[PDB]
Ligand binder design. Structure first.
Ligand code: HEM
Length: 291
């Protein structure tokens, strides 16, 4: 199965900047969500989980088909809580009914990262909705209770290498774990709706204790009130990951650049872009537009 990007008919960069802007304005307006964290983090996670079902071996799952809109995928236990991101995007989709679902879920993530003062993420249009029977089964998203070997093997299926994995994991600066959702509780840091390299700094610099939470699962906790999942902590247990963690803790621009590449790649896995497709779009933030 080849998934060829097909530009929504007649649309160009300005159309998608209008969708960007509507997302960004609602992010600004709907600021109460999740104890004033706002929707940025869950939109980033929505983009990742709708992309992260991809299997490089047979091109099943991935962002192209926008299959999260079907009940098997929106009810995946791994996706618990993402319905909030979907509901956020609903009025956006109503205003811009021409955008595909995959394009909107992925664009939500791009828009969230950028509006949260993260790197620019080039974004390409052209995902096309595919039918209900193309929805991937549950179980393709990763478990959090595992070690570095698990993480490394997991991400090979998404064609991500060590650097790409460690960069992508930096998104755990954002938002928080919620006990009723994942069986883990707490934020990873203080700046959880501003995109920074804090995840790496906290991994290296906090004094972590291995504790059990109220769901009886182990997680790493600090006196500052932060947590790390076992899979996060694996990035400093594994010496290859550790080197990269230290690099990003010590170079914010490098983290931004590597995150941007890896996140675009994640969002584009499985998609074939024709030779004459438009170049990737780089959207202006609201701030850059004076909006
Ligand atoms: C080994 C890989 C990963 C595992 C096991 C993992 C696991 C988790 C878990 C358990 C949660 C908490 C869900 C909740 O209780 O609300 C979470 C939240 C989150 N994850 Fe991941 N994650 C991984 C990779 C990623 C990647 C690659 C990204 C995106 C680039 C990402 C972005 C997020 C964000 C932004 C949140 C916060 C969501 C919110 O506040 O609502 N994660 N992750």
């Amino acid at each position: 199965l080849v998934h060829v990007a097909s530009v929504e008919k007649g649309r160009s960069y300005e159309d998608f900047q209008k969708v960007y802007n509507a997302i960004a304005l609602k992010l600004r307006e709907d600021d109460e969500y999740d104890n004033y964290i706002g929707y940025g983090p869950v939109l980033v996670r929505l983009a990742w989980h709708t992309s992260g079902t991809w299997d490089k071996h047979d091109n099943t799952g991935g962002s192209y088909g926008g299959t999260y809109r079907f009940k098997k995928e929106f009810n995946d236990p791994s996706n618990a809580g993402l319905q909030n991101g979907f509901k956020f995007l609903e009025p956006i989709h109503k205003e811009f009914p021409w955008i595909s679902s995959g394009d909107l879920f992925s664009l939500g993530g791009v828009t969230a990262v950028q509006e949260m003062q993260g790197p620019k993420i080039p974004w390409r249009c052209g995902r096309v909705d595919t039918p209900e029977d193309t929805t991937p089964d549950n179980g393709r998203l990763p478990d959090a209770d595992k070690d570095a070997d698990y993480v490394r093997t997991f991400f090979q299926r998404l064609n991500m290498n060590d650097r790409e994995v460690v960069a992508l994991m930096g998104a755990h600066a954002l938002g928080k774990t919620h006990l009723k959702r994942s069986g883990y509780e707490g934020p990873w840091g203080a700046a959880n709706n501003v995109f920074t390299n804090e995840f790496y700094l906290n991994l290296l610099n906090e004094d972590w204790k291995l504790e059990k939470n109220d769901a009886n699962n182990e997680q790493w906790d600090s006196k500052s009130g932060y947590m790390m999942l076992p899979t996060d902590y694996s990035l400093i247990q594994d010496p290859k990951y550790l080197s990269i963690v230290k690099e990003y803790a010590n170079d914010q621009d490098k983290f931004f650049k590597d995150f941007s590449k890896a996140f675009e790649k994640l969002l584009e896995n499985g998609i074939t872009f024709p030779k004459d497709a438009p170049s990737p779009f780089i959207f202006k933030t609201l701030e850059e537009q004076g909006l």
